[PDB]
Write a protein that binds this ligand. Structure first.
Ligand SMILES: [K+]
Ligand SMILES: [K+]
Ligand SMILES: [K+]
Ligand SMILES: [K+]
Ligand SMILES: [Mg+2]
Ligand SMILES: [Mg+2]
Ligand SMILES: [Mg+2]
Ligand SMILES: [Mg+2]
Ligand SMILES: [Mg+2]
Ligand SMILES: [Mg+2]
Ligand SMILES: [Mg+2]
Ligand SMILES: [Mg+2]
Ligand SMILES: [Mg+2]
Ligand SMILES: [Mg+2]
Ligand SMILES: [Mg+2]
Ligand SMILES: [Mg+2]
Ligand SMILES: [Mg+2]
Ligand SMILES: [Mg+2]
Ligand SMILES: [Mg+2]
Ligand SMILES: [Mg+2]
Lengths: 394, 59, 64, 60, 114, 50, 71, 32, 166, 420
RNA sequence: UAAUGCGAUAAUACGCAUGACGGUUCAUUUUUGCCGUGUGUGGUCACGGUAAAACUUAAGAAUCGUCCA
RNA sequence: CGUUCUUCAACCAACGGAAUAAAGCUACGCUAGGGAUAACAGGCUUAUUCGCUCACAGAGUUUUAUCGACGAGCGCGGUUGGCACCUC
RNA sequence: GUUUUUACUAAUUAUAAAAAAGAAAAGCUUAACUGCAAUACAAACAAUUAAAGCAGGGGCAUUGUCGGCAAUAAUGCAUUGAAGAAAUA
RNA sequence: UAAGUCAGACGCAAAGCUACAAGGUUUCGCGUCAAAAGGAAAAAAGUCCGCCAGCGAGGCUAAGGUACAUAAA
RNA sequence: AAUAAAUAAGUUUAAUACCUUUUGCAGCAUGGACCAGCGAUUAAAUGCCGGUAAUUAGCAAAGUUAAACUAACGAAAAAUA
């Protein structure tokens, strides 16, 4: 705290005490959801909007170690308890605090009540977007992704935010611009607009400053948003991938390869693409990424080779994960059928493990199967060569 | 293998001990030499037992 | 213990406090080993604590 | 005057058995039990002071 | 003999530099949170406005001090703000600041020191 | 503090907290430690036979 | 040295909430103490009234209230 | 280990060492 | 452990904190030539047992003498030591004196019972801390320094050692 | 302070001026000024040797006031124990009470839902009706009012008791206040054997010129009773009561307006006043509408035929209000605390009968609950499922079928929880 | 915080001007000593503190000097 | 003549101030009590006193023959003191 | 006591108080009031200490402050006597 | 309990007074005696271990001991 | 301090009276030679606080003494019509 006059009395008149720092330290020191609950129980009467905002981010940090399992019960209980404070302080938050509230609750895959989201949106709807200026770059990237993840669709909110952020787009970091680009591609009322053109242009000179994950997202969003390269993003993004094809993680390499393939720019690079997958197939390939890999390889037209039976390994990996939504299972089966490989006739066929796992899973979830679903599976089963109404050999 | 509980046995008498140390023994409910109690393994219990390591045996 | 060597009250024999014998030294060594052992055990307990605390029955708590 | 700093923490949790002074409360405790597990613990703590009257009432 | 602090939602601040005088109006919800600036007018804006129409000598002139007060009055009136509390500091005793405050009071804005 | 009269400070603080709790409801309504509290057991080890 | 409201409420409506809390606190204290800790006097006479409030100073003459008529 | 040790001791009839049907197999308490 | 209550941790009125002299580790300053005071002191002011810092060295000379123990020396003792050192070393020797007796001590005459106030000044003393350097020498050789050390050791109640600059 | 020791609150000038006086009656003032059940018990215990029937009558009446303070919950243990001890004194002095004292005694014990023993209740009744009620003449209006309602709440249905009481009170009906007459009318409606007696007609006629003096609460009850007692409106009370309601539609509290509105709808006198009726409900919905009155509002609006409008979704808010009452969630906001909202009183278990009635009424409204993501009736049924899960023991075959019919009617029959 | 800062008419329209060198003022708890409490045959013990006192190597910021290597 | 309110004054400075005021002698003494408390003796302490060792400066003048010091340490319980532990 | 101005930031028996504060200079004033007071510090008791707030009549400002003095010492129970006013008899 | 008590003592650890003396004196933290038998050090109020409802020719230990006195290498 | 606990009856081990007064007494502090008899919180009136009962008490004898009690805010609406 200082009494010296200055240009920004808004951020200089804030009162900071030792007691507030004491509570914030306890929140950060908590190492588990069980410990964090006890910290909040002791401090019930001494929680302020800053403490509530920080706690929501703590839930995001705590759940990162629980990579495999779903959201734990104590995390859900904490989220419900915190929401009681959010409603109480709905009109006492800053734009920076609201930014980190939505991100924290969105990372736990929780949905905020529509009445509460409307109240929190007043930070950017009131004062003609003056408060947007107070927000820094880190706040802006969380506001776009946080509200987008919540499913909040309000034209006035998004129109005002876009207008107040347009001047600063060229001077944001590359990753932040990529985040905004992905959000725009997901909103129909922002396609082919000045905001979209400005965002694409600002990214043109910042292509080389993107991180692998953000680089893949930008290329995916750019391809859908701008089929015709009127901004030059696609050419630059493709060039960077070619130069650094082997320098990116597997999941990023799969995403870019699929996007390039669907752009009808396939090249004889399959030999280079296959080797990374077999080297790292049992890891760095969740169900979503495996589907993208299958679509890209099948669309490109690579044929199974004796040296590297990629399809055989992929089928085994798919079976391991199954042993999921029926739609994903149906889509995977169709892609395998389009591959042109047999499963039933041969004793040891590349696709045999997948279909065998599929039959076992369907038997346990026969209630979910519908007439259309059964017909689609039957077509896939007929295509691969299993139509006798008998279980797979394996 | 998690440690779920601790066993505390009294070794020394109440005579000649400071009054702020007798309170700890009374909270653990130890009254006689060679008497044993079972307590839950919690951080608050361990802190108290660290103030009287010369009066008891812990396992 | 008494260190004072003056006065008419003979807390110690003439010459002051006497030095420890071999048995007394051995006695004091063992008293310290027990104390050090207790602190070592508390270290093991802290490194192997379970997530959920066990609930133990008590008749007096049950009544009230 | 002051030998410990801070707010007193939670009391330790100690497993205890019934004492001879409360032998006359056994019948009341049986009535207050609300489940088989609780009644099992009540009898176990009072094992050294069980009498034929207590065994008969538990079965009832 | 320092007086106790009193919390107010709307406060007026002045920043007097070598070259210009800056006036801000900030709204607060609690002392522990940052405020929201609702008005931001300095003699730099007045100089650019008057110079086009009426020549002025420099930003720190009586003409610009009155112009800044007038612009502040319009913004507060549009936002339905009629009463503010002035934050007193070393810069508050500057001659340029005092002229602006006097003009604001005559225009109709109620400025309170305590 | 010099006086030997017993202090009434704990009584004065309790009256203040009780008044606030009576009139102002709390925001939280659950405690995780209470929710997952398990059944009471006699001991954590097998019994020693005679 | 600062005093912070209960729920960080700095609005001007907090004053009335504080007034109610003051009344409640006195009721809590009287309940805990018991009936035999008397908090008001009960004399065999009434205290004089001056300027609309209760006064501890006596009048020159003591009289029963309302036991006299005009003239 | 506590469960795997309580069972072994439980599977021992020490009261059967004072029943006159005993041999040198009713005292082999430790190692079956 | 620190013996304070929770209100003291937050609103203590002891804003300007000074370490007590009895336990302060700062080296004592060089003696000055101010006149001796006529104000009675307390007995603690003439005693200090905390050791010297672990960075003490010679400041001016090449050789010196240090004390390995704490002690309280009177003015009479210092004068006898000064004459012994001057005679032993030479007339053409450089000597630095780093100590001086400045703390008054009181005493009462024989035949006086306890009470009726404190006594009158009798002599002056100075505290000595372990490892402190008492004298420094220059324009001499090492053998001469040893001779000075042996000359004064019988005249002091504490063990003494030699210090050299390198 | 300065007068008393540390921690003792300072004197209240209002109380001090009551206790400091030249006149006697100290014990009566002490019991009258008691602020809690425990305090009153201590006063009676320390004054046992000097208690008299007048002291016992006041003590039982005080139980009514203490209960009112402790609202939002059922009768507490200390109140029950205090009532039990007072009954022993009533038996002791049962032969020494006057008509006025008996009237106060019954009223206080009735307000606490305490059932006087039949033997003691008979004795108290005998005192009032002894000597053919010739002693009832020396009683004021309040004494008569409390006699009628106090015994009716107890359930005393002795025909001879009521016959004698009615005969003595009959000549004084024209000279009673409007509120007193309204209380008498309520008792007459509840007693079937007096439905067609001349006493009922005399009461209705006596109330004709005193309609304007009825309080909003008594006025609402009088209109309810008159509808059942005189469906033909021969006395003209219904016409006069309806006219006053129309003139002063917005001048009454919410609870009284809802009760009168429901009575009009069941009388098939609906008029295009729904627009005026809807706005007060939405304006004050979080307060002045407990569970019972919320059901009354739904029945009146549904019977009248009001349909959901975009500007004012009355049915949507009522579902949220119903869910709030069932769950019992409270709010710490300063406005809610100072406004004394009913929802912040706490949690009160409601009969399953009301839950079934509300569910049926919502189903008859014609709005959906399940299909839409945000439907007007979504919050109520979601709260209902949570509440029922904790009280499955009370569910039987008939109750389950009744809810199942309501669930199907609204459009939730897939065996899945409500979205909200 | 270049709508900055400083000024010898000192007012601010005019003067110096945000780099570079030099000299001053402000991390494995830097790690040792030391202090406090407890226990103690007077130390082969435990924990904590030093934003109270001695003690290391930096990097940066604020002036100041300067035709600049 | 009495009561209440607004106020003040004197001795209380032995300053919680009251029996209105108010000094001495007793070796002519008397009674009730205390080793809770002094004088002789014992006890504890050792500043002081006394003795020894280191120190070998300075006188003697080759000798530490003899005399002898600043200063420090230790001992003794015989000098002058301190305390109030035993006996009124 | 309270308003205005600024090339000033001291002193006390003693003391690192204090910059939206003080001191000095200029102007107007008597709150160095009447009747009450939540809640606390301290404390064997007696007394001693701080004080939001309500009504009346005022002062300087023009909606803030004033129930004496930077703070920590400058004192004395009850009784008896005396004075101003008021109510009885 | 509207009772008794308002003569306290010493050990370890600090400070004032004395002479960094006293089994001295004045405060302060803990313990013991006072009002506490039993065991160890020679006798042993205040040091170390340890708190006696009664009886018994059972067993395990604490402080301290284990060529004789005097139980145990 | 003239006894105690044991014993193969030879002996072995443990063991400084009581009262009063004291920080502390085997006390080199106080009182008692021994036996029998005598020898010290009692009664009245009044007040306060517990316990146990009477259910106002005393006279008188359809009428009198003593004590005790004697207004505080008339605040509840529980009708599956
Ligand atoms: K001990
Ligand atoms: K005196
Ligand atoms: K004598
Ligand atoms: K004899
Ligand atoms: Mg001796
Ligand atoms: Mg041992
Ligand atoms: Mg005599
Ligand atoms: Mg003596
Ligand atoms: Mg003494
Ligand atoms: Mg007092
Ligand atoms: Mg005013
Ligand atoms: Mg003042
Ligand atoms: Mg005394
Ligand atoms: Mg005394
Ligand atoms: Mg002594
Ligand atoms: Mg005694
Ligand atoms: Mg053994
Ligand atoms: Mg032997
Ligand atoms: Mg004595
Ligand atoms: Mg004699």
């Amino acid at each position: 705290n200082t009494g010296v006059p200055g240009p920004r009395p808004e951020v200089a008149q804030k009162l900071s005490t030792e007691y507030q720092g004491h509570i914030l330290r306890m929140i950060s020191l908590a190492e588990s959801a069980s410990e964090l609950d006890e910290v909040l129980w002791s401090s019930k009467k001494h929680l302020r909007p800053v403490h509530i905002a920080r706690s929501c981010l703590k839930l995001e940090y705590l759940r990162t170690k629980e990579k495999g399992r779903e959201v734990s019960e104590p995390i859900k209980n904490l989220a419900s308890e915190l929401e009681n404070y959010v409603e109480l302080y709905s009109t006492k938050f800053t734009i920076g605090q609201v930014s980190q509230l939505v991100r924290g609750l969105s990372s736990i895959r929780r949905n905020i009540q529509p009445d509460l989201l409307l109240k929190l949106a007043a930070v950017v709807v009131a004062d003609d977007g003056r408060q947007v200026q107070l927000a820094n770059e880190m706040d802006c990237r969380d506001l776009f992704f946080g509200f987008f993840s919540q499913g909040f669709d309000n034209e006035l909110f998004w129109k005002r935010l876009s207008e107040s952020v347009l001047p600063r787009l060229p001077y944001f970091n590359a990753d932040v611009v990529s985040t905004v680009l992905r959000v725009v591609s997901g909103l129909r009322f922002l396609h082919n607009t000045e905001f979209a053109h400005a965002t694409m242009t600002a990214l043109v000179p910042k292509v080389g400053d993107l991180s692998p994950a953000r680089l893949a997202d930008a290329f995916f969003s750019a391809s859908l948003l701008d089929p015709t390269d009127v901004s030059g993003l696609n050419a630059k993004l493709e060039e960077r991938f070619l130069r650094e094809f082997t320098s990116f993680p597997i999941k990023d390499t799969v995403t870019m390869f699929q996007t390039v393939t669907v752009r009808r720019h396939s090249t004889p690079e399959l030999a280079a693409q296959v080797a990374p997958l077999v080297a790292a197939q049992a890891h760095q390939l969740p169900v979503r990424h495996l589907r993208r890999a299958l679509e890209g390889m099948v669309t490109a037209g690579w044929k199974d080779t004796a040296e590297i039976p990629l399809y055989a390994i992929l089928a085994k990996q798919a079976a391991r994960l199954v042993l999921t939504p029926v739609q994903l299972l149906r889509q995977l089966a169709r892609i395998f059928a389009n591959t042109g490989l047999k499963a039933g006739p041969g004793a040891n066929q590349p696709l045999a493990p997948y279909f065998a796992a599929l039959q076992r899973e369907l038997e346990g979830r026969l209630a979910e199967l519908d007439e259309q679903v059964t017909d689609d599976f039957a077509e896939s089963f007929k295509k691969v060569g299993i139509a006798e109404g008998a279980r797979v050999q394996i | 293998e998690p440690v779920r509980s601790l066993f505390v046995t009294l070794r020394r008498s109440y005579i000649g001990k400071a009054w702020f140390h007798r309170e700890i023994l009374q909270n653990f409910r130890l009254k006689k030499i060679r008497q044993t109690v079972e307590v839950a393994n919690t951080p608050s219990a361990r802190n108290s037992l660290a103030k009287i390591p010369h009066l008891v045996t812990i396992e | 213990v008494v260190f004072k060597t003056t006065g008419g009250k003979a807390w110690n024999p003439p010459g002051g406090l006497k030095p420890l014998t071999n048995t007394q030294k051995r006695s004091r060594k063992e008293n310290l080993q027990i104390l050090l052992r207790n602190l070592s055990v508390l270290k093991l307990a802290a490194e192997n604590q379970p997530e959920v605390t066990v609930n133990l029955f008590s008749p007096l708590k049950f009544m009230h | 005057t002051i030998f410990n700093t801070g707010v007193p923490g939670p009391r330790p949790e100690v497993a205890q058995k019934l004492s001879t002074e409360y032998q006359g409360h056994i019948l009341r405790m049986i009535s207050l039990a609300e489940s088989a597990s609780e009644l099992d613990e009540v009898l176990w703590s009072s094992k050294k002071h069980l009498r034929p009257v207590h065994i008969a009432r538990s079965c009832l | 003999p320092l007086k106790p602090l009193v919390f107010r939602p709307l406060k007026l601040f002045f920043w007097a530099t070598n070259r210009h005088v800056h006036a801000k109006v900030v709204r607060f919800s609690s002392p522990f949170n940052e405020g929201v600036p609702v008005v931001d007018i300095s003699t730099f804006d007045a100089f650019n406005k008057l110079k086009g129409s009426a020549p002025v000598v420099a930003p720190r002139s009586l003409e610009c001090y009155k112009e800044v007060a007038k612009m502040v009055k319009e913004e507060t009136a549009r936002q339905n703000i009629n009463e503010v509390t002035l934050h007193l500091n070393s810069h508050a005793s500057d001659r340029g600041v005092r002229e602006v405050v006097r003009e604001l009071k005559n225009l109709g804005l109620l400025v309170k020191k305590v | 503090v010099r006086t030997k009269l017993p202090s009434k400070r704990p009584f004065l603080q309790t009256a203040s907290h009780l008044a606030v709790n009576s009139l102002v409801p709390s925001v939280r309504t659950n405690r995780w430690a209470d929710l997952i509290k398990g059944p009471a057991v006699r001991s954590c080890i097998p019994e020693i036979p005679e | 040295i600062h005093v912070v409201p209960i729920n960080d409420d700095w609005s001007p409506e907090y004053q009335k909430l504080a007034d109610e809390l003051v009344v409640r606190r006195a009721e809590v204290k009287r309940q805990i103490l018991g009936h035999h800790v008397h908090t008001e006097p009960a004399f065999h006479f009434s205290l004089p009234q001056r300027n609309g409030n209760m006064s501890w100073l006596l009048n020159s003459v003591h009289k029963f209230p309302g036991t006299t008529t005009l003239a | 280990x506590x469960x795997x040790x309580x069972x072994x001791x439980x599977x021992x009839x020490x009261x059967x060492x004072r029943x006159x049907x005993x041999x040198x197999x009713x005292x082999x308490x430790x190692x079956x | 452990f620190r013996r304070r209550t929770w209100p003291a941790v937050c609103g203590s009125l002891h804003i300007w904190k000074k370490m007590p002299w009895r336990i302060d580790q700062a080296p004592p300053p060089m003696p000055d030539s101010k006149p001796l005071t006529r104000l009675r002191a307390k007995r603690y002011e003439g005693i200090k047992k905390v050791v010297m810092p672990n960075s003490t060295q010679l400041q001016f000379g090449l050789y010196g003498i240090r004390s390995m123990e704490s002690a309280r020396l009177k003015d009479n003792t210092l004068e006898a030591i000064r004459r012994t050192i001057r005679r032993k070393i030479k007339k053409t020797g450089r000597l630095w004196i780093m100590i001086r007796a400045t703390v008054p001590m009181t005493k009462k005459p024989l035949g006086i019972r306890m009470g009726k106030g404190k006594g009158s000044i009798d002599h002056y003393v100075t505290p000595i801390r372990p490892g402190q350097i008492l004298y420094e020498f220059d324009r001499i050789s090492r053998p001469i320094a040893l001779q000075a050390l042996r000359a004064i050791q019988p005249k002091l109640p504490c063990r003494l050692g030699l210090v050299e600059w390198s």
